[PDB]
Design a protein around this ligand. Structure first.
Ligand SMILES: *C(=O)[C@@H](NC(=O)[C@H](NC(=O)N1CCN(CC)C(=O)C1=O)c1ccccc1)[C@@H]1N[C@@H](C(=O)O)C(C)(C)S1
Length: 513
């Protein structure tokens, strides 16, 4: 009984590129060699030559065919270069048949593994963009008819029943040049500092495009041999943290929007504590007795921010935070992505009101944090995020008055450049602005906080005169060269922002440096 078999024609999976066409995920053609044992049994004399061409051992190769002498089909070796396979087929060994397949290849490897993700052995998206746009990127295989004889030898390819159709191309918002830069600097910082993990997000403040998104640890998607679950996490999007002092500029925005505060107002912060109930608000830098509003950010006074918070009420703070998108849904639909949490209480005690205002009792993703800073930097206009390239600048929503936004921009520029500021965040050639942050990590195995485990943050944008990009840098558990946001994350911000701005041809607004 001889028969017509149907065989599959593999389809081309769609090309994933960066915003300028750099390929990030590509289906590369490869050759899979298969054999008809029956046909091979009639050429035993050719085996050793064949086994040596496939690099296999002669006897082990022979046992294989002998074990499967009954079958009319077995794989010899899968995934060869189109050159090698045709080299072996040129040997004319009976019973040896090739077929063109595809291998998904990631040219930038670990640089973009988190954002891009990967496919499985049957080319289904399993992680990341591969997963998220699987329908878009997948193609439909073809089918064709082959005529086989009694003993499984292929006589004729009779017809193609249906053609293969390739997937569609996807252009991301990422700029791979910025991504290369960001990845390397974040990795350096992680190693210098003895940190466990980190994230780094860069955003176009005008368009909402995610220009770069890297995390540590990472992995090579082209070789997942000894892959650990930890390394696979796109932490920027799926890991949440308490933003700490990095939310003060929004507290401060609420204050200026309340009508009850103005930049020149001075707040008494002595003695760097403020007892309320059984809980004690503390400042780290206990030097100045009184600060103006700009000095509350520069020195990052929790006490100072608390007092403003007691004046204006929680709802005015909760509401600015909500409007800049903290604890809100981004709309990206990245797999695993978290919304985070902006607590809503019926009545707001003093404690929760103060901790909210200086960044605890709420949890954000690095992506949200950057989104919020982008709104601030875009003169109070929030624009929706995109992880795909944006055709035309979208309509944004005015979430902070331009005048408040402008004022807070000036303040944050001070935080960086003023004496006693976060000088390590300065970008050569440009004026930049931003906020340091340093948060104790939450205890494992109990409520409350860890006595020696810190998360280091820096969040800012540049250029100060006309902002173009917002950036966030988050490093977990540094243990080698201090832990303050402004010692650990700010220098990373400095370098990447420098490169970023250069690589996008933004003209320097601070010729003096
Ligand atoms: C901003 O981040 C601010 N950081 C701290 O005050 C920080 N405080 C905390 O981590 N916590 C944990 C949660 N709770 C309970 C609700 C707190 O009361 C609280 O304050 C802190 C504390 C000790 C050592 C380092 C950090 C200020 N800004 C940072 C910064 O890096 O810019 C400073 C270190 C200057 S303090």
């Amino acid at each position: 009984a001889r028969s017509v078999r149907h065989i599959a024609i593999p389809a081309h999976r769609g090309l994933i590129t960066d915003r300028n066409g750099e390929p990030l995920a590509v289906s590369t053609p490869v050759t899979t060699l298969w054999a008809n044992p029956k046909e091979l049994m009639t050429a035993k004399e050719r085996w050793p030559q064949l086994a040596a061409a496939l690099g296999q051992d002669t006897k082990l190769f022979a046992d294989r065919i002998e074990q499967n002498a009954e079958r009319e089909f077995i794989y010899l070796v899968r995934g060869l270069t189109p050159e090698q396979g045709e080299g072996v087929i040129a040997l004319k060994v009976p019973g040896v048949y090739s077929i063109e397949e595809f291998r998904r290849f990631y040219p930038a490897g670990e640089v973009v593994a988190h954002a891009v993700g990967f496919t499985d052995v049957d080319d289904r998206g399993r992680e990341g963009i591969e997963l998220a746009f699987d329908e878009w990127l997948a193609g439909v295989p073809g089918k064709r008819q082959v005529l086989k004889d009694r003993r499984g030898r292929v006589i004729k390819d009779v017809q193609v029943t249906k053609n293969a159709k390739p997937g569609k191309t996807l252009a991301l918002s990422i700029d791979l040049r910025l991504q290369y830069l960001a990845h390397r600097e974040l990795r350096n910082a992680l190693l210098e500092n003895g940190a466990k993990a980190g994230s780094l997000v860069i955003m176009d403040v005008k368009t909402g495009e995610i220009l770069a998104m890297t995390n540590q640890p990472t992995y090579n998607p082209n070789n997942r041999r000894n892959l650990q679950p930890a390394a696979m996490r796109n932490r920027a999007m799926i890991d949440v943290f308490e933003p700490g002092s990095t939310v003060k500029p929004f507290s401060m925005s609420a204050a200026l929007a309340s009508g009850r505060w103005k930049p020149s107002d001075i707040v008494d912060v002595y003695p760097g504590t403020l007892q309320i109930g059984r809980y004690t608000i503390r400042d780290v830098s206990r030097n100045s007795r009184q600060l103006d509003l700009t000095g509350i950010l520069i020195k990052s006074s929790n006490v100072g921010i608390s007092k403003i918070a007691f004046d204006i009420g929680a709802e005015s703070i909760y509401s600015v935070m909500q409007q800049v998108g903290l604890g809100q849904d981004t709309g990206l639909g990245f797999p695993g992505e978290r919304v985070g949490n902006l607590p809503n209480h019926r009545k707001w005690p003093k404690a929760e009101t103060a901790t909210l205002a200086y960044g605890y009792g709420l949890s954000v993703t690095a992506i949200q944090l950057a989104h919020a800073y982008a709104a601030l930097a875009n003169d109070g206009k929030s624009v929706p995020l995109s992880m795909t390239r944006v055709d035309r600048v979208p309509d944004g929503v005015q979430v902070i008055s331009p005048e408040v936004a402008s004022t807070v921009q000036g303040m944050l520029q001070q935080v960086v450049e003023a004496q006693g500021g976060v000088f390590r965040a300065q970008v050569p050639g440009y004026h930049a602005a931003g906020k340091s942050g340093t948060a104790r990590k939450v205890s494992v195995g109990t409520k409350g906080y860890r006595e020696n485990a810190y998360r280091s943050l820096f969040a800012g944008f540049a250029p100060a005169t006309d902002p173009r990009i917002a950036m966030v840098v988050v490093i977990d558990e540094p243990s080698k060269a201090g832990y303050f946001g402004g010692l650990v994350s700010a220098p990373v911000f400095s370098k990447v922002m420098a490169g970023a701005l250069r690589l996008m041809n933004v003209p320097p607004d601070n010729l003096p440096t």
